[PDB]
Design a protein around this ligand. Structure first.
Ligand code: CL
Ligand code: CL
Ligand code: ZN
Ligand code: ZN
Lengths: 209, 233
């Protein structure tokens, strides 16, 4: 049970938008994860060994193995816990449940939700052309996508505070709809109903750029 | 070709001085490295899959496979570069040489020197008793040993600056004498003559402990870099 990542989140935010790790490589390190693609071309989400690309123009595609990534986090998902939510529940309330069960911040968590989302807000980063700006300074218009009563899959990690530059500290969740056509990096959501699985991980492996 | 480490420098700093990783475990992840031992009992140096414990009372001994460590760094040493020195050369100049060859700071380096050290100072951390205090708050004297015109072995890593809590950022080097009876954690040194070998590494593997002291520790203290620098230099 091992968190694998390609490159550093510090390195990404710095404008290092290309890397030589392939989707082929990713799937050798996990069946489960998230990240982005070279040239910052969309959001990556992965589960059950399926890897999807979520792009600005709302389109979506299964990823090609040869496609490359400048940042991704993978594991072999092995949840320890199941929660059934039969009434609406906020993203933060979800996190309160997991935080209460796995209170140490010095571990990783991985978590999946299958369910109906009452509300979901994503961003999906647009493809960038060189020379690369810092991500906080993407001059390109990038909208907040909104989903209401949409069935979908959520994939996420909770990363220790003290690893802020290495990975995304705290909760980092990606989302894709049932039809596998929309989603992205989640900014907030409310679950109408669904099934949560999660667990702790305490091994970290980094391929450096 | 992988940097293996058990726990984090962060954790050791905060006072988590007991781990469950054994020396035998370490040796399954490399033939080369450095660290400390449970209860902060001294310095560990490892090379040619030989492991030594340098203690605060000046004793040196082969480590036992079943001894535990709260923090250690290992790899299978596969140097790509080699430079010999026939004239003296400072610790910084050594680092300058490696930096010229491996300028990327996204990479780790492992380095070994075999030779005659004109000068060296080493520290060895003193064994602690619970309740453990943080390293910036240790009450015991921390002995410094001096070596002049001594043959020996230097083992070291270069860690990317942006990984300062995970590991010891920058250069971290340990030392033992030819007769394996003195050394420890290097503070300064000057090589009289000898042979440098080193190489680049771009994979890092961290085992996080699951014991209670580790799980409760604060690993993002205020001025992390300054704190670690006050302890490692
Ligand atoms: Cl992302
Ligand atoms: Cl050390
Ligand atoms: Zn994201
Ligand atoms: Zn040391």
């Amino acid at each position: 049970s091992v968190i694998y990542q390609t490159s550093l989140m510090s390195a990404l935010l710095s404008g290092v938008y290309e890397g030589d790790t392939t989707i082929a490589d990713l799937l050798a390190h996990g069946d489960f994860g998230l990240g982005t693609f070279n040239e910052l071309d969309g959001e990556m989400i992965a589960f059950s060994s399926q890897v999807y690309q979520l792009r600005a123009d709302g389109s979506a595609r299964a990823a090609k193995p040869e496609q490359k990534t400048p940042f991704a986090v993978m594991t072999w998902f092995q949840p320890q816990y199941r929660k059934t939510f039969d009434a609406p529940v906020s993203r933060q309330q979800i996190h309160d449940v997991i935080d209460q069960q796995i209170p140490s911040d010095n571990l990783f968590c991985a978590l999946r939700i299958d369910g109906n989302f009452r509300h979901a807000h994503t961003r999906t980063v647009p493809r960038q052309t060189p020379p690369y700006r810092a991500m906080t300074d993407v001059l390109d218009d990038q909208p907040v996508f909104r989903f209401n009563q949409r069935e979908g899959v959520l994939v996420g990690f909770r990363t220790p505070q003290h690893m802020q530059g290495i990975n995304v500290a705290g909760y980092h969740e990606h989302f894709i709809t049932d039809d596998r056509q929309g989603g992205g990096h989640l900014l907030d959501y409310q679950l109408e109903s669904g099934v949560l699985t999660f667990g702790e991980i305490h091994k970290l492996m980094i391929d450096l750029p």
